[PDB]
Amino acid sequence: ENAQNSASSPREKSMKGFLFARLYYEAKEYELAKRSVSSYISVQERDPKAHRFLGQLFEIEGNVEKAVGCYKRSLELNPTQKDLTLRIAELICTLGRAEYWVERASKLFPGSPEIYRLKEQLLSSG
Amino acid sequence: HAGTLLLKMAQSCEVQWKALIEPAALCYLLAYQVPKPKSKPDNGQGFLEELAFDRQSKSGHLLLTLSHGKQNFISEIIETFANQCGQSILLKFLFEDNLSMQDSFMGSDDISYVENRVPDLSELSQHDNGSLRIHNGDLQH
Amino acid sequence: HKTGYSLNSFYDQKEYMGRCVHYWKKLLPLLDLVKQKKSIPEPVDPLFKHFHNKDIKVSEVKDLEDEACIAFATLDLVDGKTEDAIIAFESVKNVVAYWNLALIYQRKAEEIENDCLPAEEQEEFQECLLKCKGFLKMICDEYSAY
Amino acid sequence: EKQIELIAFYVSHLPQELAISQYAVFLENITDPDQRQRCLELAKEAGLDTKTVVENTRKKDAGEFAHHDFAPALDSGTSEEDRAKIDVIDWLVFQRAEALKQSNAIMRKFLASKKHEAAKEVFAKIPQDSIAEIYSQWEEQAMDSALPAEDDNAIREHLCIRAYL
């Protein structure tokens, strides 16, 4: 409230709203956090923050598909994407369609117990 | 400062009168309503910036408290200034027959370029947040 | 209380509400001694000593006590003890207690149960009868909520 | 006289030698600080006298100038400068940006001679959390402002070092 008024005074609609989004993220309000995060991303282009804000929001909302989409766009941006493959492998485990992602995770991390188990489960699903 | 001295004259004689508020009101109005300098490029602009913060803060606070009620600023601007008479009224009080009105005065200073604006409640708080630059933890202020 | 509630930050709402609860819990014992009794003796003015204003009449004790109870209930509400918070809100009968009850019913019954909505209905009906007296004590006036 | 905790304080009371005092303390300790779980971190080098600017200034002065006699073969000089960068880097992880930039420069010095193990140490003993803990603002709008033309450049230097390694 007061922070939003102080911001609308300078009229940033910006990292202030992003801090409100981060506070809603630390707290438990998925719709408000996602709305503020999207409004901030609209005002501040793209960054690890915008992608990770939206990806944590979707991960908490359960839409692992939308989370994987945001993570793929983030990895296409590629300033620093290392958790993208981990999120893809977790989406594969939650999920043929997991076979490609498990082969990719295994080729990007040979010592991967979880990803190798996911690969075994995918080859089982002779 | 001239408006504040008008307040001083009244309070010194007995108290803020019913005549040494409207010219003081003009003095604070035309101090608030000058555009804040902003260079955004030596020549320390931060000093002009902080003094402008404090000046606009004082103008707003004191001109709101002198007329909390509305229907003041319009008649103020329309009467206490004119081509000559308003400046004559403000200046003959300020310096009682010690300066020419035509020369070496405010006579060449034009005012009818200014208009009405009550300070806003957000901009006033920002003016105080700026005025806190040259009054760092002064208990009286 | 107002400065804390106005904020949305959890880690500052909790602190401001806890400390306002602190000041009220320290004022609780001091206010009970108004039965023709000397409040606290002070010949000298320690930091803040005025008179004919600082004295609370016998009428306003109950009102301030109810405000303190609302403060307690709101502290428990901004912690997560959802049921005993409502228990604490079901003691005072001003507008704020009803409004907080109704809002918590909303929060706990966004899409949960239908039979708990009659609670919301009756709460807003009492709020209607109280706005029939034109009380603007609520934080955001009834024009938006009701 | 080994009353270091107080002679260093009086030094810090003298303005110009605040660097030489921290130099004495660090060059005496770090080699074998007798770092055991006691003595509450030696009161943080007499309370930072001990700034990265003047410290790296003295390190750059000593490593290469060697006014009277400089060895025709740099005799573990670059190795010790790199170990200083790495140790101050660990300490910073516990001066992160200054350690990172000096590490980038020293790793460039090591690459100029193609010392694989030396550059590997310079890049590896550096924390895994340097860039993340240095990033003050994540939203790229404010991150352009908070990001310095030297800090972002040093981060890119570390990324290129890792890619080449």
Structure tokens at D81: 């400068």
Residue D62 DSSP class: I
**In this complex, which chains have at least 3 CB pairs below 8 Å with chain B?**
A
Q: Do B123 and A9 touch (CB under 8 A)?
A: yes
Backbone CA torsion sign across D95, D53, D116, D69: negative
Q: Do C8 and A1 touch (CB under 8 A)?
A: yes
In sequence order, the 6+-apart residues with CB closer than 8 A to the CB of A13 are A7, A39, A43
Other C-beta atoms within 10 Å of B106: how many? 16
Other C-beta atoms within 10 Å of A99: how many? 14
Is the Cβ–Cβ distance between B74 and B64 less than 8 Å?
no
Residue B123 DSSP class: H
Chain A interface mutation, best of C2, C3, C5, C9, highest count of A Cβ atoms under 10 Å:
C9
How far A37 CA lies from chain C's nearest CA (Å)? 16
How far B107 CA lies from chain A's nearest CA (Å)? 38
Which of D1, D24, D21, D23 is CA-nearest to residue D11? D21
Interatomic CA distance for residues A2 and D60, integer angstroms: 50
3-class DSSP state for residue B107?
Answer: coil
C chain contacts of residue A27, beta-carbon cutoff 8 Å: 10
Is the Cβ–Cβ distance between B29 and B64 less than 8 Å?
no
- Interchain touch D–C (≥3 Cβ pairs closer than 8 Å): no
Q: Do C9 and A1 touch (CB under 8 A)?
A: no
Could you say which of C6, C7, C10 has the minimum Cβ distance to residue A27? Answer: C10
Chain D interface mutation, best of A36, A43, A47, highest count of D Cβ atoms under 10 Å:
A47
CA-nearest residue to A17 within chain D is: D139
Backbone CA torsion sign across D54, D58, D63, D65: positive
Interatomic CA distance for residues A97 and A103, integer angstroms: 11
Chain C interface mutation, best of A23, A25, A35, A36, highest count of C Cβ atoms under 10 Å:
A23
Q: Does A9 touch chain B (CB under 8 A)?
A: yes
Other C-beta atoms within 10 Å of A78: how many? 8
Phi and psi at B109, nearest 5°, equal -90, 115
In sequence order, the 6+-apart residues with CB closer than 8 A to the CB of B75 are none
A chain contacts of residue C79, beta-carbon cutoff 8 Å: none
In sequence order, the 6+-apart residues with CB closer than 8 A to the CB of C22 are none
Here the contacts of A20-24 (C-beta below 8 Å, separation 24 or greater) are A20/C8, A21/A53, A22/A53, A23/C8, A23/C9, A23/C10
Burial (CB count within 10 angstroms: exposed 0-12, middle 13-18, buried 19+), residue C11: exposed
Here the contacts of A30-33 (C-beta below 8 Å, separation 24 or greater) are A30/A57, A30/A60, A30/A61, A33/A57
How far D78 CA lies from chain A's nearest CA (Å)? 31
3-class DSSP state for residue D91?
Answer: helix
Helix pair angle (D18-29, D4-13), 10° resolution: 160
Helix pair angle (A64-77, A48-61), 10° resolution: 170
Interatomic CA distance for residues A86 and A64, integer angstroms: 13
Helix pair angle (D151-164, D96-111), 10° resolution: 40
Q: Residue type for D146, please?
A: A
Other C-beta atoms within 10 Å of B59: how many? 22
Which of C98, C93, C104, C100 is CA-nearest to residue C125? C98
Q: Residue type for A38, please?
A: S
Which of C125, C129, C107 is CA-nearest to residue C116? C107
Q: Do A2 and C6 touch (CB under 8 A)?
A: yes
Q: Do C8 and A26 touch (CB under 8 A)?
A: no
- Interchain touch C–A (≥3 Cβ pairs closer than 8 Å): yes
A12-50 as b/e, with b when 16 or more CB fall inside 10 Å?
bbbbbbbbbbbbbbeeeeeeebbbbbebbbebbeebbbb
Interatomic CA distance for residues B42 and A30, integer angstroms: 50
D chain contacts of residue A43, beta-carbon cutoff 8 Å: 141
Q: Does B126 touch chain A (CB under 8 A)?
A: yes
Structure tokens at B74: 């319009």
CA R_g for chain D: 17
Chain A / chain B CB contacts < 8 angstroms: 5
Interatomic CA distance for residues A58 and A31, integer angstroms: 10
Residue C80 DSSP class: T
Which of C27, C145, C24, C23 is CA-nearest to residue C95? C145
Chain A / chain C CB contacts < 8 angstroms: 13
In sequence order, the 6+-apart residues with CB closer than 8 A to the CB of C107 are none
Structure tokens at A102: 């498990």
What is the SS3 assignment for C17-32?
HHHHHHHHHHHHHHHH
**In this complex, which chains have at least 3 CB pairs below 8 Å with chain D?**
A
Structure tokens at A34: 């996602």
Other C-beta atoms within 10 Å of B7: how many? 19
Helix pair angle (D77-93, D96-111), 10° resolution: 150
Backbone CA torsion sign across C1, C2, C3, C5: positive
Half-sphere exposure of D155 (CA within 13 A, CB side): 18
> What are the Cα distances from residue B5, in Å, to B10, B21, B37, B55, C144?
9, 11, 25, 15, 49
Which of A41, A57, A50 is CA-nearest to residue A79? A50
3-class DSSP state for residue B94?
Answer: helix
3-class DSSP state for residue C61?
Answer: helix
Chain A interface mutation, best of D139, D141, D143, D147, highest count of A Cβ atoms under 10 Å:
D139
Is the Cβ–Cβ distance between B39 and B45 less than 8 Å?
yes
Q: Does A20 touch chain C (CB under 8 A)?
A: yes
Structure tokens at A65: 């598909």
Interatomic CA distance for residues C10 and A32, integer angstroms: 15
The angstrom resolution of this structure is 3.7
Other C-beta atoms within 10 Å of D132: how many? 12
> Following CA atoms A69, A73, A79, A83 in sequence, which dihedral angle do they give, to the nearest 10 degrees?
10
- Interchain touch D–A (≥3 Cβ pairs closer than 8 Å): yes
Interatomic CA distance for residues A110 and B40, integer angstroms: 55
Interatomic CA distance for residues B55 and B62, integer angstroms: 11
> What are the Cα distances from residue B120, in Å, to A9, A109, B18, B41, B123?
11, 60, 26, 28, 5
Interatomic CA distance for residues A108 and C137, integer angstroms: 62
Structure tokens at B23: 């010219």
In sequence order, the 6+-apart residues with CB closer than 8 A to the CB of A47 are A79, D138, D139, D140, D141, D143
Interatomic CA distance for residues B79 and B85, integer angstroms: 9
In sequence order, the 6+-apart residues with CB closer than 8 A to the CB of A62 are none
- Where chain A is broken, by preceding residue (C–N > 2.5 Å)? 95, 125
N-term to C-term CA, chain D: 46
What is the SS3 assignment for chain A?
CHHHHHHHCCCCCCHHHHHHHHHHHHCCCHHHHHHHHHHHHHHCCCCHHHHHHHHHHHHHHCCHHHHHHHHHHHHHHCCCCCHHHHHHHHHHHHCCHHHHHHHHHHHHCCCCHHHHHHHHHHHHCC
In sequence order, the 6+-apart residues with CB closer than 8 A to the CB of D118 are D78, D79, D82, D110
Interatomic CA distance for residues C25 and C43, integer angstroms: 26
3-class DSSP state for residue B37?
Answer: coil
Which of C138, C106, C137, C102 is CA-nearest to residue C122? C102
Chain D interface mutation, best of A15, A40, A46, A56, highest count of D Cβ atoms under 10 Å:
A15
Structure tokens at D132: 């993340």
Interatomic CA distance for residues D149 and A18, integer angstroms: 24
CA R_g for chain B: 16
Three-point CA angle C112, C113, C117, nearest 5°: 115
Is the Cβ–Cβ distance between D127 and D86 less than 8 Å?
no
A chain contacts of residue D141, beta-carbon cutoff 8 Å: 14-15, 43-45, 47
Backbone CA torsion sign across A34, A40, A41, A46: negative
CA-nearest residue to B129 within chain A is: A6
Structure tokens at B70: 């509305």
**In this complex, which chains have at least 3 CB pairs below 8 Å with chain C?**
A
> Following CA atoms A6, A12, A15, A17 in sequence, which dihedral angle do they give, to the nearest 10 degrees?
60
Interatomic CA distance for residues A57 and A33, integer angstroms: 7
Which of A50, A37, A104, A39 is CA-nearest to residue A77? A50
How far A18 CA lies from chain B's nearest CA (Å)? 22
Which H/E stretch holds residue D151?
helix D151-164
Is the Cβ–Cβ distance between B81 and B26 less than 8 Å?
yes
B chain contacts of residue A9, beta-carbon cutoff 8 Å: 122-123, 126
In sequence order, the 6+-apart residues with CB closer than 8 A to the CB of D159 are none
Structure tokens at A44: 């501040």
C chain contacts of residue A1, beta-carbon cutoff 8 Å: 6-8
Interatomic CA distance for residues A102 and A83, integer angstroms: 15
